[PDB]
Write a protein that binds this ligand. Structure first.
Ligand SMILES: [K+]
Ligand SMILES: [K+]
Ligand SMILES: [K+]
Ligand SMILES: [K+]
Ligand SMILES: [K+]
Ligand SMILES: [K+]
Ligand SMILES: [K+]
Ligand SMILES: [K+]
Ligand SMILES: [K+]
Ligand SMILES: [Mg+2]
Ligand SMILES: [Mg+2]
Ligand SMILES: [Mg+2]
Ligand SMILES: [Mg+2]
Ligand SMILES: [Mg+2]
Ligand SMILES: [Mg+2]
Ligand SMILES: [Mg+2]
Ligand SMILES: [Mg+2]
Ligand SMILES: [Mg+2]
Ligand SMILES: [Mg+2]
Ligand SMILES: [Mg+2]
Ligand SMILES: [Mg+2]
Ligand SMILES: [Mg+2]
Ligand SMILES: [Mg+2]
Ligand SMILES: [Mg+2]
Lengths: 63, 183, 52, 141
RNA sequence: GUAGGAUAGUGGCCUACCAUGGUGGUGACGGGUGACGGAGAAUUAGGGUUCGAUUCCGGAGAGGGAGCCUGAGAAACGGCUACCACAUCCAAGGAAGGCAGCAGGCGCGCAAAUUACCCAAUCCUGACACGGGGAGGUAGUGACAAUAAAUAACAAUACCGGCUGGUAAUUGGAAUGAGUACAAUCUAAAUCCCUUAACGAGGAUCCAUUGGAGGGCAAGUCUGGUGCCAGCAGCC
């Protein structure tokens, strides 16, 4: 106790930070907003849309 | 493939070949009581380490004196023993390694050193202190009685800076009693 | 000409044995303290250990 | 005397190979007969209790050892399994499900019980040890 | 062996003709394997014995065969075609199948986990710095196996043995983590660990268990019950 160790980065500018840093780190620093999504739902929607051809494919995945 | 599977592990002790030797039991109990060990497993682990070291020393001694492998490994082993305090400077030959006993290794335990330097009234008291985090080797708090103290680190043993016996902030019992007596 | 043995006799002695309650005794220390007690009993303080 | 020719390695190897069969343990482990036995090379087997039996103890002892006739589920073979501990036969009933283990001597009789090579470990999914010590209760159904 | 066909190519790989050759107690051929092979695992005077399904390398398979398109690369099966065995739907006219992938279910058995989260790490792939990846990682269950390590420490009093030691559900204050929880930290986001405000111990009920006490083999010629019975007993 009483001591800690970590890693630190200091970018020349916020633009460089945004261009090179991970999205999760940017969200941690507040420069980005987390988007709520579910990978299983995305996979199911993609599979559902796979069976529909044309413009209607866009709403096919909703179901 | 699971990457965790590639991590390796090994045993540290063996059970006695004959479970119920009376003389062996008496000697083991004597050593355990003298050094405040919780069970025979710790003594058997120390014996396993000593046997490994002695076997390595014997294997090296079988080789020719001018053998580069013998020279290198013997120098390494002697340096290790000197670092951990098992052997003194005058004991600068591999033969003195074979004259090492379990007591020599047990004397290097942090519990034994804490008891010897006078920070504890008894070996059991020392064990309780180390497991209760009242002891630090250098600037690091150590709570493992089996901790093997090196010669350089022997003189740095001191009470933990965040403990009642090393600094301020007394224990919860003392604080509760003070609060009760405040009225 | 007797009743030496049969299947109906199972549990005879166990059922016949009178039931005696277990005495309430203070727990012994565990681990290091237990070994300390054993060492003190067998070496420091002091026929077999359970002799009469 | 032994053959000692430097070129007699084949003869020595073949003689040892032939003579290994005189060893009972080697023959037991290499004849492939373990699969025809009731357990078929397993440590334990489940079975159904067919009937309670009493086996007379061998001389010079005199007693009625309690056993059960058990039919193994996986192959239908019928065996006799001893029921250890006092009054433990009372926890066994006809058509019960019992786990059966070896008697400790690797397919041979133990003690004064003749022709018994198995013992009961569990009945109705509950250990006979637990039933004897009253730690658990035999399921009603 | 000669000459051809086929193949990406050599070759009885196949065709026509020709010759009678080829292997074998130095074990051919045939049979068994609860037989994938190796790197390796267990035990270690030496020599040896046993194991190797499983994360690395090589091979084979995708219910059993056979055939084939595409493609640089497949005799591919999360590609197609036919038969065989199973098998879902039907409006009875037809139509669709392949978990020895990740979960999960039935069966089988002595015998083995969640129908979770994520591409943040490692790397692969595509037109591609950006998408995707049940590969892989995180977390859940997990006493396979392995490591460290709590269940008490110290004084006063009384008993004992020689100031020195042991015992006491007698007294006294000190110490602390198991637990609990702000907070921070961790984390792709969580959780765990580490750190740490306020709590958390006297029969410290915060109560250690598994086997044994005739010998092998450490430990009772103690007390009650039973009386070759019940039972114990690896062997005696
Ligand atoms: K008899
Ligand atoms: K007898
Ligand atoms: K060719
Ligand atoms: K030819
Ligand atoms: K193979
Ligand atoms: K291509
Ligand atoms: K599956
Ligand atoms: K990735
Ligand atoms: K014994
Ligand atoms: Mg040709
Ligand atoms: Mg096979
Ligand atoms: Mg293999
Ligand atoms: Mg597997
Ligand atoms: Mg492979
Ligand atoms: Mg294939
Ligand atoms: Mg299948
Ligand atoms: Mg098929
Ligand atoms: Mg195929
Ligand atoms: Mg595939
Ligand atoms: Mg499949
Ligand atoms: Mg299991
Ligand atoms: Mg373990
Ligand atoms: Mg406890
Ligand atoms: Mg003895």
């Amino acid at each position: 106790g009483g001591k800690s160790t970590g890693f630190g980065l200091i970018y020349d500018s916020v633009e460089n930070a945004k261009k090179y840093e991970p999205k999760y780190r940017l969200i941690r620093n507040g420069l980005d907003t987390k988007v709520e999504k579910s990978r299983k739902q995305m996979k199911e929607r993609k599979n559902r849309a796979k069976k529909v051809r044309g413009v209607k494919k866009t709403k096919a995945g909703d179901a | 493939v699971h990457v965790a599977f590639y991590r390796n592990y090994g045993k540290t002790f063996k059970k006695p070949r004959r479970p119920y030797e009376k003389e062996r039991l008496d000697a083991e109990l004597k050593l355990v009581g003298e050094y405040g060990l919780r069970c025979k497993r710790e003594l058997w682990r120390v014996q396993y380490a000593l046997s490994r070291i002695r076997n390595a020393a014997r294997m090296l001694l079988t080789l020719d004196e001018k053998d580069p492998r013998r020279i290198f490994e013997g120098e390494a082993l002697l340096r290790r023993m000197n670092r951990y305090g098992l052997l003194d400077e005058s004991q600068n030959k591999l033969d003195y390694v074979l004259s090492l006993t379990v007591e020599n290794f047990l004397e290097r335990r942090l519990q034994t050193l804490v008891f010897k330097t006078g920070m504890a009234k008894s070996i059991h008291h020392a064990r309780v202190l180390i497991r209760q985090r009242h002891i630090r080797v250098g600037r690091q708090v150590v709570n493992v009685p089996s901790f093997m103290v090196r010669l350089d680190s022997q003189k740095h043993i001191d009470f933990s800076l965040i403990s009642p016996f090393g600094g301020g902030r007394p224990g919860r019992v003392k604080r509760k009693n003070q609060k009760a007596a405040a009225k | 000409g007797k009743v030496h043995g049969s299947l109906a006799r199972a549990g005879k002695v166990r059922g016949q044995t009178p039931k005696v309650a277990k005495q309430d005794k203070k727990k012994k220390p565990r681990g290091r303290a237990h070994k300390r007690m054993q060492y003190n009993r067998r070496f420091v303080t002091a026929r077999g250990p359970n002799s009469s | 005397g032994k053959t000692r020719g430097m070129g007699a390695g084949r003869k020595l190897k073949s003689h040892r190979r032939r003579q290994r069969w005189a060893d009972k343990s080697y023959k037991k482990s290499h004849l492939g007969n373990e699969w025809k036995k009731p357990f078929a090379g397993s440590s334990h087997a489940k079975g159904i209790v067919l009937e309670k039996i009493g086996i007379e103890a061998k001389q010079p002892n005199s007693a009625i050892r309690k056993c059960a006739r058990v039919q193994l589920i996986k192959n239908g073979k019928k065996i006799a399994a001893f029921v250890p501990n006092d009054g433990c036969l009372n926890y066994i009933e006809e058509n019960d499900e019992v786990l059966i283990a070896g008697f400790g001597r690797k397919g041979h009789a133990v003690g004064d019980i003749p022709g018994v090579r198995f013992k009961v470990v569990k009945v109705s999914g509950v250990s006979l040890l637990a039933l004897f010590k009253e730690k658990k209760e035999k399921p009603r159904s």
